[PDB]
């Protein structure tokens, strides 16, 4: 009935033995930002809907003649089965038209002559970049998907035969959707055409690209998704710039944008995962530029090495050890130093996990985009599908081992970080609150005093708004004896007690404070920066650059899970569409986790034996991704069907090799040593059996797969018992 009693109950519950575990005007800006976010949530939904579309016309009983007894009978079934599927296409067309119109309207609004040299927040520019990336990915999904057109036009033949489209508006909308689907690169073309009509949009694209380049250069990102989004936005913006009116090459000579940095970034990193199993080639946006023909010499990224993951394992391993060692030592109230240490440790761990995930995704995408051939790889047969050469024969044993090791390290670090969820959350939130309060209550005092003293009302208003939005007065009100408010210098003084509690600021408050604070430092803004001294602006930039990751760290669990996403290693919709009905679904030997596990088992590598289980939860990750993001039942059904046989094969092979190794070791133990020495001297040495670490797998009783707990030990015991009985019978 009281808070103290409830806390006590929780402690009591935790105290149980659990052995055998393992073996202003900113309001308008906020509203527009919210609207953009809402639009984005819908665009992502439409993109995921498009990605997971399968040809629905294949199952139709195609009619060869025009006088079939049931020709009229199947059209109603086709109509009633494809009506909702065409409703989705109509909704997608309406949504994309509305999104294009809204983006053009916002661009026009922010491109006005008087509004050109005003102040605009960086978040809005990032949102516009997200919008252009969404448009690009939607156009790519529309282009790649060749089954949507067939399904829609089959429904068209089904509806027109029944004469159910007699309504003129129905005919008009059907024609509009048909022509929308027929055209190639329709979304990009329409947006581009609507862009030239506006004058000066190149400047908005330019400052967006500059912001993205600055963010990428300073590593102003946490999750690999943002790292790839920055490059995708840069490329798409560069593509949009080149046209009839605006030329990047002439713009570059004006130093408005930097092309060398983008070229180097593309050269270092060439491919990123656009969506699902599809990857985007960054240099394509440049090679397809309007004026690329006469300026190809300017770009080295387009012309053509460093994706080999086997040569980067030393740094990965060393980093992993150093971090694990640092974290192990942090397994009643503490000082701010400990909380800051925990905060920085959590940030470093998240950054390292993101770096590893980015490396893995980049190498996977590069391998996908660069399939091998029998000329290069001798093992590859003459006949093979695109996915075969792309994945199965495109990896070496060392490369597979490196990938498995990286994945296992990522998952181990993830679980270790999750074990310390509460401590990390408390430390991060306490540090954030202390920093925010100390800043807003001490650092802004001197600047405020200066502003009041020199009658700077513009600065005074925003400073007071900042100090009123977040500051929490322990006394319940702003102090009245503060000399800064009166403008006269403080004595000698005036100690103020800042309270301390563990809570992060609300998203709205943090965004509002950041937007106000980085408005004072704005060069473009009569510049407000010109009305402030040096030390105050330096401290303001330091605080602004430090507070970037507050939102990400507050949602520590979501950020941690996002930085370790590996669900994109199983989906094969793109390659399935590239088959056009020949392959309904790829066999077992094409899913990367299965190839890794089978290679590890067959090669019988002692070092990699302990990673076989770590290389098996990719199925769980993919199932979670499908059930939470894609929300498609058939994907989960196929994953479960594949796992049902993958686990059986793995168990059988593991038991067989374990029994063989144990029998060989037993036989070698009893062999006479003098005979072995004599044979070695004579030149007939009997090779000893290499050691192995099967005991770790033998002591495993918690193998988790799709919510199922499997007792591997029981199956291994049954298999070894059968083998022993067979051996005894054979001996008899």
């Amino acid at each position: 009935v009281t808070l103290e009693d409830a806390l006590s109950n929780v402690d009591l519950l935790e105290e149980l033995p659990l052995p055998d575990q393992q073996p202003a005007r900113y309001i308008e800006q906020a509203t527009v930002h919210s609207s953009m976010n809402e639009m984005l949530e819908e665009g992502q939904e439409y993109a995921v809907m498009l990605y997971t579309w399968r040809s629905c016309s294949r199952a139709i009983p195609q009619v060869k003649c025009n006088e079939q007894p049931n020709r009229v009978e199947i059209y109603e079934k086709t109509v009633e089965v494809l009506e909702p599927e065409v409703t989705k296409l109509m909704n997608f067309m309406y949504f994309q038209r509305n999104a294009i119109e809204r983006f053009c309207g916002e661009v026009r609004r922010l491109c006005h002559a008087e509004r050109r040299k005003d102040f605009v927040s960086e978040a809005y520019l990032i949102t516009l970049g997200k919008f252009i990336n969404m448009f690009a990915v939607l156009d790519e999904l529309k282009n790649m998907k060749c089954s949507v057109k067939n399904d829609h036009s089959a429904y068209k033949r089904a509806a027109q035969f029944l004469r159910k489209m007699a309504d003129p508006q129905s005919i008009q909308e059907s024609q509009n959707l048909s022509m929308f689907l027929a055209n190639h690169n329709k979304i990009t073309q329409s947006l581009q055409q609507q862009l030239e009509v506006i004058s000066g949009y190149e400047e908005l694209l330019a400052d967006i690209v500059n912001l993205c380049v600055d963010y990428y250069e300073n590593r102003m990102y946490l999750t690999p998704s943002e790292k790839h989004m920055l490059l995708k936005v840069m490329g798409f913006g560069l593509y949009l710039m080149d046209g009839s009116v605006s030329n990047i090459y002439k713009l570059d000579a004006k130093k408005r944008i930097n092309l060398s940095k983008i070229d180097k970034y593309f050269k270092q990193l060439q491919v990123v995962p656009l969506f699902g199993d599809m990857q985007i080639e960054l240099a394509r946006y440049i090679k397809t530029s309007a004026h690329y023909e006469e300026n190809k010499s300017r770009w080295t990224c387009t012309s053509s090495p460093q994706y080999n993951i086997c040569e980067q394992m030393i740094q990965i391993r060393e980093d992993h050890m150093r971090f694990i060692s640092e974290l192990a030592r942090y397994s009643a109230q503490k000082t701010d130093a400990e909380y800051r240490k925990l905060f920085d440790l959590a940030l470093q761990g998240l950054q390292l996990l993101s770096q590893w995930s980015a490396h893995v995704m980049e190498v996977y995408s590069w391998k996908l985009v660069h399939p091998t051939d029998k000329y290069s790889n001798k093992d590859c047969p003459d006949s093979a599908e695109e996915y075969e050469r792309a994945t199965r024969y495109n990896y070496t044993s060392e490369e597979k081992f490196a990938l498995v090791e990286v994945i296992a390290m990522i998952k181990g670090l993830q679980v270790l970080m999750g074990r310390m969820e509460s401590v990390f959350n408390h430390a991060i939130r306490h540090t954030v609150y202390a920093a925010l309060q100390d800043f807003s209550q001490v650092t802004l005092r001197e600047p405020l005093r200066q502003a009041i003293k020199k009658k700077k009302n513009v600065i005074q208003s925003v400073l007071q708004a900042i100090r009123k939005t977040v500051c929490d007065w322990e006394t319940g009100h702003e102090p009245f004896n503060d000399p800064a408010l009166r403008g006269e210098k403080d004595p000698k003084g005036f100690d103020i007690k800042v309270p301390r509690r563990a809570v992060g600021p609300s998203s709205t408050q943090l965004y509002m404070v950041r937007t106000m604070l980085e408005s004072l430092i704005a060069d473009k803004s009569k510049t407000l920066r010109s009305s402030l001294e040096g030390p105050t602006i330096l401290d303001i930039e330091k605080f602004h650059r430090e507070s970037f990751f507050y939102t990400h760290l507050i949602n520590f669990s979501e950020t941690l899970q996002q930085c370790c996403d590996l669900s994109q290693l199983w989906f094969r919709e793109f390659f399935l569409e590239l088959t056009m009905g020949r392959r309904i679904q790829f066999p077992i030997e094409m899913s990367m986790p299965w190839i890794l596990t089978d290679h590890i088992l067959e090669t019988k590598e002692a070092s990699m034996m302990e990673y076989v289980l770590y290389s098996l939860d990719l199925y769980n990750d993919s199932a979670h991704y499908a059930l939470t993001r894609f929300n498609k039942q058939f994907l989960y059904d196929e994953i479960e069907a594949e796992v049902n046989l993958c686990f059986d094969q793995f168990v059988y092979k593991l038991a067989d090799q374990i029994f063989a190794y144990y029998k060989v070791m037993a036989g070698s133990l009893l062999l006479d040593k003098r005979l072995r020495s004599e044979c070695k001297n004579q030149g007939a040495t009997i090779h000893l059996p290499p050691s192995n670490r099967y005991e770790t797998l033998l002591k495993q009783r918690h193998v988790q797969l799709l919510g199922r707990s499997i007792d591997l030990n029981r199956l291994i015991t049954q298999r070894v018992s059968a083998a022993m009985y067979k051996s005894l019978e054979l001996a008899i």
């Binding site: 009935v1 009281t2 808070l3 009693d5 409830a6 109950n9 929780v10 009591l12 519950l13 149980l16 033995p17």
Partner: protein
């Protein structure tokens, strides 16, 4: 051995029934607190009322989970001990059997 059946068919089902009753009552209480906050003249009263309700429910859930968990642990301990006891009697039986076989051979 009697306490095994007691703890099996009188404690665990009681905890289950209690936990399902808790889920239904908790949904009802969230709806009730939301309603009280907007059809009450004194918002602070509903807030305190809401705070009290949230504090309570947590304690009840924790207590039920603790009791249930304790019961499960005790049941497992009882079962393991009985299994161990059975293993001793079975070993004695096997010793008697092979002794009889050796006697027959002699």
């Amino acid at each position: 051995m009697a306490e095994l059946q007691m703890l099996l068919e009188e404690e665990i089902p009681g905890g289950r029934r209690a936990l399902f009753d808790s889920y239904t009552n908790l949904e009802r209480v969230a709806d009730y607190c939301e309603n009280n906050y907007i059809q009450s003249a004194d918002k602070q009263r509903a807030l305190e009322e809401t705070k009290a309700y949230t504090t309570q429910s947590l304690a009840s859930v924790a207590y039920l989970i603790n009791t249930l968990a304790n019961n499960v642990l005790q049941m497992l301990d009882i079962q393991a001990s009985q299994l161990r006891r059975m293993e001793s009697s079975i070993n004695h039986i096997s010793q008697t059997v092979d002794i009889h076989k050796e006697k027959v051979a002699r």
